[PDB]
Amino acid sequence: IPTYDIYSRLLKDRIIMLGSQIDDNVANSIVSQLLFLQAQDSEKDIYLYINSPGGSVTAGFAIYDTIQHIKPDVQTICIGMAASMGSFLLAAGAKGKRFALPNAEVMIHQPLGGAQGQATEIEIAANHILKTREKLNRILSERTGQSIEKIQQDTDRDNFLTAAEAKEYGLIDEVMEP
Amino acid sequence: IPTVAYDIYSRLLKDRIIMLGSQIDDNVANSIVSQLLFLQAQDSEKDIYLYINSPGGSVTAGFAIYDTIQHIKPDVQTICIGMAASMGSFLLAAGAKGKRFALPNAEVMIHQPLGGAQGQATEIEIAANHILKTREKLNRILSERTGQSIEKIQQDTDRDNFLTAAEAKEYGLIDEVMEPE
Amino acid sequence: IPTVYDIYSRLLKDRIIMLGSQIDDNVANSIVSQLLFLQAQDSEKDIYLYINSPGGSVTAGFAIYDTIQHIKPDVQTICIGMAASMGSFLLAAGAKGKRFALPNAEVMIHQPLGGAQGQATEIEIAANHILKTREKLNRILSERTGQSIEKIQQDTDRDNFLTAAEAKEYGLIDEVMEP
Amino acid sequence: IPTVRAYDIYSRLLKDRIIMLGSQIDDNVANSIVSQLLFLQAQDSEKDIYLYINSPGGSVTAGFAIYDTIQHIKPDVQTICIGMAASMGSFLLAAGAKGKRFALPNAEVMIHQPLGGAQGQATEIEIAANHILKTREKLNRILSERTGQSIEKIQQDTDRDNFLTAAEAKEYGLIDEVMEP
Amino acid sequence: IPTVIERAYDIYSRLLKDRIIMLGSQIDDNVANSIVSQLLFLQAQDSEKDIYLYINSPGGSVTAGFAIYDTIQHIKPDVQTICIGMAASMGSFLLAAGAKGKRFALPNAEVMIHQPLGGAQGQATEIEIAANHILKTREKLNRILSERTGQSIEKIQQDTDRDNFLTAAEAKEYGLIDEVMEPE
Amino acid sequence: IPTVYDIYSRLLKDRIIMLGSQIDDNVANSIVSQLLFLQAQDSEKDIYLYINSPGGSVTAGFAIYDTIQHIKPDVQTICIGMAASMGSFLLAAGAKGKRFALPNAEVMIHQPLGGAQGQATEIEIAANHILKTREKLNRILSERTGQSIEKIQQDTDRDNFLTAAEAKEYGLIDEVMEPE
Amino acid sequence: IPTVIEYDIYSRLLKDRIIMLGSQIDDNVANSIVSQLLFLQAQDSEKDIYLYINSPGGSVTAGFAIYDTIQHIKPDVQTICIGMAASMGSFLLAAGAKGKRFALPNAEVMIHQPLGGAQGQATEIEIAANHILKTREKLNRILSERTGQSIEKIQQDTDRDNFLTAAEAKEYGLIDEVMEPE
Amino acid sequence: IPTVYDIYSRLLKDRIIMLGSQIDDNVANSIVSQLLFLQAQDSEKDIYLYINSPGGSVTAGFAIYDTIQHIKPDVQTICIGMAASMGSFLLAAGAKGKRFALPNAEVMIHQPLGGAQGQATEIEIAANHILKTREKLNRILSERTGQSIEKIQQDTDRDNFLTAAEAKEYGLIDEVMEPE
Amino acid sequence: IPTVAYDIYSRLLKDRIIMLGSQIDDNVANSIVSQLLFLQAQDSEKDIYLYINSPGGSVTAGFAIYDTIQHIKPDVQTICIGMAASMGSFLLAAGAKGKRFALPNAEVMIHQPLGGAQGQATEIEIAANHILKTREKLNRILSERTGQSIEKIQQDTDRDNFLTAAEAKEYGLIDEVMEP
Amino acid sequence: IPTYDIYSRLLKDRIIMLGSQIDDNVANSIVSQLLFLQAQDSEKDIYLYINSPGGSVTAGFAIYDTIQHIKPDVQTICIGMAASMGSFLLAAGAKGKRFALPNAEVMIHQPLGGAQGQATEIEIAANHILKTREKLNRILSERTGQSIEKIQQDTDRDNFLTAAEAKEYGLIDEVMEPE
Amino acid sequence: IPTYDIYSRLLKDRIIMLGSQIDDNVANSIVSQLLFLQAQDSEKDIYLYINSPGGSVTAGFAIYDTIQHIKPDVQTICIGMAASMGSFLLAAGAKGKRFALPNAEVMIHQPLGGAQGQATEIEIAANHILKTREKLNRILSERTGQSIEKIQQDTDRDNFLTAAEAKEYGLIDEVMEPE
C-alpha cells in the first residue's frame, strides 16, 4: 500500500512478490511482470519471492512455463510459506538460485480437485487429475533429483518440510542465512 | 393421508400392495424392505404387487430393494405408473419375469449412474473406479433382466433415454403394457 | 382437518376423492391408492373426483390418468374453483357424460413447462422429451374433447382461460352443474 | 386445540352444522369447507348450515369453490361475520342465503378489487391482465346480484380498500341483519 | 401439555369441561377462532352457568379481539374475566368486556392500555384510507372502553395516547375490572 | 417423553408439577392450569412444585405467583439444579416452611431485564415501568424472605449466585433437603 | 410408515426379533438400537436377533454403544447387510455372531479410517489426535479379531475408502456368507 | 497490480494483449477495443494475444474472433496455463503459423453449455439455437484445424483435455514454444 | 481496463468510436448519449462508429440512445460484434441506412418486449396497456427501418427469433455483412 | 466513465445529465452543478437532460427550487423516460425551453410513501403526504396550465404519456424533432 | 488516510507501522518495506512500531526471518498491544533495541490451529503444529534468555505481561519513558 507502491518500487529492482494464493489473476500479473522484466533486460536475474499456500495448477504452470521460457535466470526465495503449487514454483527457480529463509515452511502434497455428474464424466475428470499429478511428479523429479516413485510416496499426504529439509530433498539449493 | 383405523397405504398393504412413489433413499428402502419381509412372513406363496412411480435415487438403497425382491419366495409384480426413471426403472425390470407391467402412458427412463468426488487425486480415482464398477454391476443385471447385450445397455444409458410403455416392452424392461380393464 | 376419521376419510367412505392441491408424486400416490382401494371395495359403483388444482407434474398426473382409465368403476370429475394445466387434463379424463364443472369454476389449458441445463446434447434430449410429452397430451386431449390435434396445439400455445360454459363448448366437460 | 369419542372443538361444532372459516382462503381451506358442506348436506339436506366468517380473504378461485358449493347444495347456508370479512371473505359473507346473512355489531367488512401479478412477454402480460379483468367483472356481477347495488357502483366502491361497519354493510346489501346481543 | 385421567384430556380440555377458557397467547385469527368456538360450545352445553375466561395476553389483532368481544356480548351466559400476569392492548379490552361485577385481576397482574398500532404503504390515497380506518378503529375502541369503565371518551383518548401501565388496584379504580381477587 | 400418560401427567396424578424450563406465557399457562386442576381435585392436600428454571417473563412468573398465593392448598417448592431470576422468585413463593433446595442446587437473584426503543417519552415510559416492576419484585421478596427492601435492592443489583445453604440463610428457602 | 393389524412396520418386525438399522449412526439411533436389543433379551435371552444393516456409518462412540451391547447380551445377533454397510456400519456388520453375518449378493461393504476434527491450542490438537489414533487402533484391533486378517493388513486396507462386493466381504472375513435367493 | 503505466498497459504499448480470465461481454469489449487500437497505431506489426482462459460466453468469444479475422495485423496466440472451451477456440483463431502453446499448457475442447426454461416451444427454440451455435463452432474449428466436422463433433461430446503437443497434432496450434 | 492518459475507451472515443458492450440500462444510456452529444459538438460532419455487443435491456434507456442517434447531425454507423439481442438489435437497425453492419459470426435476435405487473386489477391493466403500446411503437419503427410489414414484424417477434448476420441483412436489420 | 469524465466535459458546455433515480445524493450533485454554472455565467442557459424513473420528493424539490432560484434559464430535455419526480422536474424548466425527444416517455402519478406505528403517527404521516401531493399538484398546475382537479384525476394512477401528449398536456413545450 | 500517505512519509524516515493482525498481506508489505529500507541504506537503523494481536505463524516468520536477514538493525517499539506473533516480532528486534511504552501490553501463548479429515491427516496436522510450537519456543528462548521448559510453561495459556514485566522476562530491553 505505501507510496509507486512498495511493490512497484521492488519491481524496478527486478523483484516480484508472490504473496497470495495462485489463481488466474495472480498468474496473469506474475507472467506480465516476467515478460516486462525480460523486455527491459534479457540478461539480469529476476528475483521471485514466494509466500503462497498454492492454488490453481494451470495458473501455476502459466508462471512455471514463463519462468522456463524467458532468457533471464529467475531466482526463487521462499519467505514464510511455499505450499503445493507454491513449493512447485519454488523448485522451478534457476538451479543453484533457489532459496528459503531458515524458518520458511515448504509443503508438498498431491493435487486436489472435484468431479460431479455421470460416471463417464467422473472418469474423465479422474483421468485428467491423475495425468496432472503425473506431469507434476515428473517435473518435480527432474528439478529435485528424486525418483518419481519417491515423489509419489512423499506427496501422497500433506508433507511439511523445514527449509533445511527442503534443501535435503532438492526443492531448494541453499538456506539463505542471516 | 386419508383414513380407512388405517391410512390408505397400510390398507393397501393388507392386500399385499406396496406403493413406491418417491425418490429412493435409505429411509424409503427400509420401509419397502420391511414391507416385503412382512408380507413373506404372512404368506410366502401369494404374489406381491409393487407399484412404482419414482424418479430414482440412491443406487445402494435401490439394491436393498432389488436383493430383497430376489431373495423372498413370493413373486413381486412391478407396475409402473407415471414415471420409472434411473434406479426406479431398474426396480421395474426387477419384478418377477412375466409379471412386469407399465400403464400405457407411463414413462420409463434409463441412464448411467450419477455421483461426485472431491479431494486428492487418489480419492477421486477411488470414487471413479467405484462408480464405474457400480455401473458395470447395473448393466450386467439389466442385461440379465432384459435380454439385451451389456454393450447395448452401455450405449443406451450413455445419456438420458426416455421410453414409452410400448418401447419399454420392446426393450425387455417390462413384460406387458396393462391395457384398460 | 375436522374429525367426524377426518373429513376427507369420511367422504372417501362415500367414494368421494378430493383433489385440491398441486399435482406432485405424493398427491398422485394418494389419489391412485384411493382409486385402487375404491375399486377393490366395489368395482361397480361410481367414483367422484373433485378437482381444484393449478396442475403440477405431468408424469404424476398421468399416474392418476392411467389409473382412472384402468379401473372398472366410472370416475366422475367435478371441477370446483380451478382446473388448470394437468388439472384440466384430469378433469377431461372423467367418464364421458360424467365430467362436470360448477358455474364459476375456471378451466385453463396451456402447453407443458419444463427446464434444461448443461450441454447442447442434453438440452436437445430434454427438448425432444418435452415436445414428445406435449404431443402425447394433445393427442389424448383431442380424443376426449373431440377437437382436432392442431386445434388443441393452437389453443394451448399460451395460457387459455375458459369459463365452465366455454369448457363445455370445448369438450373438456359434459355439463355445467346447475344448483 | 381443546378436546371434547374424542373431538376437537371444531368437530364438535361441525356436529351442530356449524363451520368455522377463521383464516385466509387458499386451496387447502376451500377443500376443508367444501368437504364439510358436502358432508352436512349428505347427513341432512334440510337443516340450515351455519358458516362463521373471520377471514382477510385469499384466493379468488378457492373462494369460488366455496361460493359455488354453497349455491349448489340444498341446505341454506347462513353466513355470520365475526371480527373481519375482507376481500374474498366479504364475497362469501354476501353469498349466504338471502335473509340469513349476518354480522356482529363490531365486525368489519372490507371490499376491494382483486389482486394479481404478471411476468414475461407482452402477450403473456396481456393474457394475465385480461384474465384478472374478467375475474373482477365476474365478482362484481355476482356482487351486484347479491347486494342490489349497480355494477357501476360496485366498480367505483371497490376501486380501493373500502372498509364498512356492520351497519354500513347492511345498508350496502352485503348482509341482511346486524345480529344484536 | 399434561394429560388428565377421567377418557383422556389435555389440561386445557379438562378445564373446558368446567367452563374455563384459557387465553394465554397473542390474539390472532386462530386464537380468536378457538375462543369463539369454545364460547359457542359452552353456551350450547348450558346457557345459564357462568363461563370463566382467564386472560394472560399481550394483545394482538384488533379485529380478532372483536370476534371474541362480540361473542362474549352475544351469548346468554355471563363471561367472567380473570387477568393473571398481563392483559395488554386488546387483552385489557377483553378483560373489560367481562360481565359487569365479574371482571377480576389477581393482585400482581398487569394491565396496559394504549392506542392501536398499524401500518400503511403505497399511494397517498391508500395511506389516507388506512389512516382513516385505524382512526375510526380507535374511536370504536375508545367508545366501548368508555361505556365499560365509566370514564369519559376524552379521558380514554388521553390515557391511551401512550403506553399506560396499571396495577390491578389501579385497574379497578379505572373501571377496567370490578375487584382485585385476594388470596382465599 | 416416556409413557407410563406421559411421565409428567403421571406425576401430576400425585399432585407434582415439574417446572424445568424457561418461564414464558405458555409455561405459565400450563402451570396455572395444573394448579387450578389440582385445587379442584382436592383443596386440602399439598401440591409439590419442582423448579429447575433460568427465569423468564416477569408477567408470566407473576401469573404463577398469584395463582400459588390464591389457591387453598399449600404449594411446596423444590429447587433442583438451578432457580435463577423469576425462577428463584417462584422458589421463595412456596408455602412457608415448605420451600426446599437440594444440596447442590443453585439459586440466583438479580434485577429484571428489559428494553426500550423510540421517542424520549416512550423510553421514559418503559423505564418507569421496569422500575415499578423491580420495586414490586423487591417488595414481595422482602415479605417472603424477611430481608429489608434496601438489602434486596443491593443484592439484586448484579447477578447474585447462592448455594442452597446460603439461600436458606438468606430466607429464599426454609430447608436444604438432605438425602433420606 | 405403514401400520399393521394384530404397530408400524418396524414394530411388527421387532416382535419377530428383527431390528432395522437403515440410517446414519448417531446417539439417537444407537440409543434406539441398544434399547431394542435389551428389550429383545428381556423377552428371550436365548433366541437369535436379526439386525439388518443399511448404513453409511456415523458416530464411532454411538456404534460402540451398539457393538458392546451386541457382545454383552446372551442372544446371538445376526447381521444382514442390504444395500450398503460403510464405515461404522461395516464394523457393526462384522460384529454379528460368527457364522451369522450375511450380505445380500449386490450389497456393498466399505471400510476406511475414522474421521474427525480438532480446533484450538497445540495441546488441544495433540489431545484430539492421540484420541482419534487410539480410536482407530481399537477399531482395527477388533476388526482383525473378527475377520482373521492381520492388523497391519487391516491398517493398509482402511487407509483410504475401500469398497468390497458381498463376495469379497466374505473372502475378507467381514461376513460369513453371501445370502443367496433361498 | 504493479506500476511501471500499470503492467498490462505497458505490455499493450508493445502490442501485447492479456486474456487471462473468463470470457464475458466486458472482457470481449476490452479485447476488441485493444485490437482496434493496435491496428489504428500500426496495421502492419503483429499483435500478440496471450490466452489463459477457462472459456466463457460464446457470443463474447465470437466478438473477439471476428475482430481478429477482420483487422489487418496478424494476431499471434500464445496459450499459457489453460485454454479451455471458448478459450481454446480463440487459441486456434490466431494467424496460421503463429499459434503457440507453452510446453505444460493445457488445452480443453468440449461442446457449448447452456440452459432453457419455460414452455415446450421456448425450450425447442433454445435447443435449436444452441445446436446451431455448436454447428457454427465446429465448422470454423474444422477450417482452422483441418479436422473433419464429424471428428470435431465426436471429440467435443465430452470434456477433451489435450497437452500442448497433442494440441499441435490436432491442429489447434502450430508449434509448441520451447524455451529460449 | 488498459491505459493508453486515457483508458482504452476514451482513446477510441477520440477517433469517434463508441463501444456498447453490455446490457442496456439508464447508466449505459447516459454514457452513450453523452458520448453521442459530445462527438456532435466536436464535429457535426464526421461519421460516428457505434459497436454493439448487447443482450438488450431497458426499452426506454434504448430509446434515449435511439432518439439521440436520430437527432444528431453526424451519421452513426452501427457494427454488431458477437450479439445484438432485444433492444440491442433495435439499436443496430437504428444506424444510418447503408452503414449498418454485422461481423460474419455475429448473432442478431429479435423478440417482443418483456415486463411485469403487480397489484390491483386496474394497475395490471395500466401496465399491460403500456407494454402493448411500447411493442407497437417498437414494431412501427422496426418496420420503417427494415422495410418489413408490421404484421410480419409482429409474427417474427412473437418468440425469440435468432438470425445469423447474413439473415439479418436479408431481413433489413443491417445493410452489409462486414467481410475480412 | 470515459476520459475529465464525459459528464464533466459536458458540464463545461453547461450540460447536466440527470439519468438515474432521484435521491439526496443525486439532488445534491445536480444542485451543486446548477449553483456552479450560475457562478461561472449567470446569463447563458443551462441544459438539464432528464432520464429518470423518479425518486425522493424532497430531493426533487431541492433540484426544483434551485432551478427556480438561479438566474440562468434551465432547459429541460427528456430522453427515454421522465417518470414521477422526473416528469415534475421536466415541467420545471424555463417555459418555452422544455423538450422531449419524439419517442421519449413521460409518466405522472401521485406520490408514494409509508407509515408505521400508532394511529396518531399514521395520521400525521397521511396528512403530510396529502399536503405533499397538493403542493405537487398546485405547482404542476402552474407549470402546465391544467386545473388542479385535472391533475388530481390524471395522477390518481400511473399515467403514461407520449412526447406529443406531454406537449399537449403542458409538461413540455416542444417535441424536439431530428434536425 | 491523511496525505504520500502518512505511512509512506514515515517510511521515508525508515519507520514501519505494524498496526493490524498479521496475515500474508501484512507480512508481504512489511517484508517489502524492510528490503526497500535496506536497499536505501544498509546501515541506518529501522524502526518497527508494533500494535498487533498476532495472526499467521508463517506470515510472522516471513517478517521474522527478513528482520534477521537484513543488515540494518531493526528496532521494535510496542504501543498498545503485542500479542501472540506480535509479541514474537517484538522480541525479534535488535538486542538492546526492543522497547515498550509504559502502558503497552504483551501477551504470549501457544499457537492456534485446526485439523479435519482422516486420523492420519489429523496426526500430520498435530505433528506439524507441535513442531511449530517447538520452533517458536526455541527462538523465544534464544531471544529472551529463558529456558525452553520455562517458555513452554509460560505459554501454555494466555499470559499477559505489563511493559515492566516484559523487560523482566527479556522480551524487551527497555520501557521507553516520556521524553
Residue numbers in the entry:
A (entry chain M): 4 to 6, 18 to 192
B (entry chain E): 4 to 7, 17 to 193
C (entry chain D): 4 to 7, 18 to 192
D (entry chain C): 4 to 7, 16 to 192
E (entry chain B): 4 to 9, 16 to 193
F (entry chain A), H (entry chain N): 4 to 7, 18 to 193
G (entry chain F): 4 to 9, 18 to 193
I (entry chain H): 4 to 7, 17 to 192
Give sentences from the paper.
Bacterial caseinolytic protease P subunit (ClpP) is important and vital for cell survival and infectivity. The caseinolytic protease P (ClpP) subunit is a compartmentalized structure with two stacked heptameric rings that form a central chamber containing 14 identical catalytic sites sequestered by two protective axial pores. In any case, even the degradation of small oligopeptides depends on some structural factors, and the most important one is the orientation and positioning of the catalytic triads formed by Ser98, His123, and Asp17224. The protein’s mode of action corresponds to that of a chymotrypsin-like protease, and it is described in two main steps: acylation and deacylation.
However, when the same assays are performed with a SeClpP sample supplemented with 20% w/v glycerol, an increase in peptidolytic activity is not observed. This simple triol is known as chemical chaperone and protein stabilizer, and if used in cell lysis and purification steps, the ClpP sample becomes homogenized with a higher concentration of extended tetradecamers, as noticeable during size-exclusion chromatography, where only one peak is observed. Conversely, glycerol revokes the positive cooperativity, since it stabilizes the tetradecameric SeClpP, also organizing the binding channels.
